[PDB]
Amino acid sequence: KDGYPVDSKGCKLSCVANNYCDNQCKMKKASGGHCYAMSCYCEGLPENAKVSDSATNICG
């Protein structure tokens, strides 16, 4: 599946470059890792990946 990976709190990962996400997503059995709207997004994550379902999370 695809989506935005979160952190230990469940907040979207603030990405700043494609290479950064490209490497992260990869480690997460993903294939399309890019930085969109300062948010990392991997395409091909595992059905049990920990990503959000919206372009905004509930961080502090």
For residue 31, the one-letter residue type is S
At 12, list the tokens: 């979207």
The candidate with the shortest Cα–Cα distance to 35, out of 54, 16, 10, 50, is 16
Any idea of the CA torsion for 5, 9, 12, 18, to the nearest 10 degrees?
-60
- In whole angstroms, what is the distance from residue 25 CA to residue 33 CA? 5
CATH of the domain at 60: 3.30.30.10
Specify burial of residue 50 (Cβ count, 10 A radius: 0-12, 13-18, 19+). Answer: middle
CA angle 21, 53, 7 (to 5 degrees): 50
- Domain with 45 in it: 1-60
Could you identify the residue written with the tokens 């990976």?
5
* Partner residues linked to 5 by β-bridges: 51
For residue 13, the one-letter residue type is L
